[PDB]
Structures are given as structure tokens and as C-alpha cells.
């Protein structure tokens, strides 16, 4: 390993802030996707946009992907994840069975929220 890839094993405080922001943005995209479906269904029933937003009942999504993406167990929200899962991923060939999240290729884009329960 002569070639030097000086990638540190820990993140700076600023990388952590950006990571938390990126997770929140993804959650907000999911939150907005459901909102549109609820509003569109309500308009189909006859309601208007305003009352749809103020409706007490919120129509939950029926698609498999959106239904699971709204489950905290499957896709936890940033305020729900643990600090370890925010910044550390699971690698089975590393001491501690964990490695820095920034070492995952395209970590900024890819989403890894869930780790095995005991790892």
C-alpha cells in the first residue's frame, strides 16, 4: 500500500453537521412525497387544497416503497437514529465491526440508515 490515500478514520465536526443535514433533507423529501399523495387523494374525493391540508385525517400511502420508507424501524428519521448509525457503518472485516461512514463510496448520496441490531 505505497500510494497514500490520506483518508482519516474520523470525521470533523463540520462533516457531521453536513451529514445530519443530508439525512434531514432525505426525510423531508419522504415527508413531502406522502403529503402530495394525501392531498391528491383528498382532491379526488372532492375536497379543495386548503381543507385537504387542514383535514384531520391524513391518508397514509399505499405503495410498498412509501409505506416502508415511513416506518421508523425500516427507515429511521435523523432525530430517531443513534449517533453511531449516523456516522458509522457496519463492516464485517473491520475491528469493532464498524468503519467510518465517510469511507463508503458516494456516502454523501447513498443512504445507509439501518445496521444489524447487535452490531
Amino acid at each position: 500500500g505505497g500510494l497514500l490515500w490520506k483518508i482519516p478514520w474520523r470525521m470533523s465536526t463540520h462533516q457531521k453537521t453536513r451529514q445530519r443535514e443530508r439525512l434531514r433533507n432525505v426525510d423531508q423529501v419522504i415527508k413531502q412525497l406522502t403529503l402530495g399523495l394525501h392531498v391528491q387523494r383528498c382532491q379526488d374525493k372532492g375536497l379543495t387544497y386548503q381543507e385537504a391540508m387542514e383535514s384531520k385525517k391524513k391518508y397514509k400511502p399505499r405503495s410498498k416503497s412509501l409505506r416502508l420508507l415511513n416506518k421508523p424501524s425500516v427507515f429511521p428519521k435523523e432525530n430517531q437514529m443513534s449517533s453511531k448509525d449516523k456516522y458509522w457503518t457496519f463492516d464485517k472485516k473491520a475491528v469493532g465491526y464498524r468503519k467510518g461512514i465517510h469511507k463508503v463510496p458516494k456516502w454523501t448520496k447513498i443512504s445507509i440508515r439501518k445496521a444489524p441490531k447487535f452490531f
Binding site: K92, G96, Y97, P116, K117, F118, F119
Partner: protein, 195 residues
């Protein structure tokens, strides 16, 4: 007697493979089942050869033998066969000759177990500590009251694991094949089989 020398009729040069990382949280082999005290791994999964286990066993027996009704149970078998070529050879020319046996021990598997009518819990702790110095990992001491380890930093008590029957569960959510079998016995299908 053949724990470190399996008696496979046909010898095979097994692949290298990878030490399993029990992501599913299985506790098979991580609970005391024969004796009063035991030893298990704390670090990540590793492979232990026959020589290391033989010599760890000798250390334990050094303390078991001077005892009344002293028994040592070996919970590990060296199933995997590893072949090693000599250092002074070019890469290639196939796989090398058999050298020894190995065993893939995950993070929290129990290796040994001790019992006796007079153990005092101190000689057992000393014996296992010494035996651990001959093995290539980090090990600790377990008793019947110790929690079952399921990860590097996570523990579990098997008693709380739920118990459930699966025959009734299948009837709750039957599969397509099972429904067909049940539907085959119906009179409108059994009486016209033609067999």
C-alpha cells in the same frame, strides 16, 4: 477423542472461506450446556488450529486432573481442513498439501466447559485465564448466571426469547403449496383423481 482429528472418509482440500459474522443474533453454541463454568471469545471471530486447542486443553487438564469427578467438555471440533504451501514456491501450481485443521469461532462461542464436586470458582477462573493465553483471541469467564453474548458489546438472556408454535402460525398465513395440498383432499378433487 477425534475432536481435533476428524475421520472424513475422503480428504478434500477445502476452500479458505470466511469466518461467519452471526448478523442474525443466533446463540447456538454460546450457552453452557454440559458444565458449571466455561470460556468463550470476546473479540471478533477468529480461526483456531488443532495445535492451539490441544495446548489450551492441556493447560485446563493440568487443573482438572487434580480433582474429584473432574470433567472437561470440548464444545469445538476442527472440521475445516487448511492446506499451506511452502514459502519457497511460485504462486500457482494448484493448491498445496494439507497441514492442519481449523475451526471458525464467532464472536461469542463457548470453547470449553468444566465441572467438579469441588471447584471453588477460583481455580476455574485461573485455569481458563491461563488457557486463554495460548489462544489467538480474547476470552472471558462464564457461569450459569452469566448473560449470553451476541456481539462485541451486546448481551442477551435467552430466557426472554419467545416460544411459539409454527404449525398454527403456518395455518394463519398458509403458502400456496400448502393450500393446494389442503384443497386436494376436498371431495370434488379427491374423487376424480383418476389414480
Amino acid at each position: 477423542k477425534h475432536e481435533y482429528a476428524p475421520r472424513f472418509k475422503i480428504v478434500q482440500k477445502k476452500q479458505k472461506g470466511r469466518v461467519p459474522v452471526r448478523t442474525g443474533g443466533s446463540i447456538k453454541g454460546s450457552t453452557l450446556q454440559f458444565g458449571k463454568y466455561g470460556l468463550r471469545l470476546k473479540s471478533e471471530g477468529i480461526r483456531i488450529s488443532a495445535q492451539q486447542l490441544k495446548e489450551a486443553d492441556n493447560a485446563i487438564m493440568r487443573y482438572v486432573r487434580p480433582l474429584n469427578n473432574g470433567h472437561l467438555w470440548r464444545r469445538l471440533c476442527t472440521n475445516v481442513a487448511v492446506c499451506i504451501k511452502g514459502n519457497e514456491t511460485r504462486m500457482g501450481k494448484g493448491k498445496g498439501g494439507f497441514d492442519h485443521w481449523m475451526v471458525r469461532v464467532p464472536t461469542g462461542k463457548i470453547l470449553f466447559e468444566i465441572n467438579g464436586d469441588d471447584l471453588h470458582e477460583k481455580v476455574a477462573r485461573e485455569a481458563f485465564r491461563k488457557a486463554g493465553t495460548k489462544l489467538p483471541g480474547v476470552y472471558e469467564f462464564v457461569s450459569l448466571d452469566s448473560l449470553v453474548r451476541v456481539g462485541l458489546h451486546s448481551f442477551k438472556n435467552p430466557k426472554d426469547d419467545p416460544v411459539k408454535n409454527f404449525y398454527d402460525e403456518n395455518a394463519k398465513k398458509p403458502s400456496k403449496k400448502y393450500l393446494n395440498i389442503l384443497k386436494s383432499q376436498e371431495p370434488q378433487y379427491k374423487l376424480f383423481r383418476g389414480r
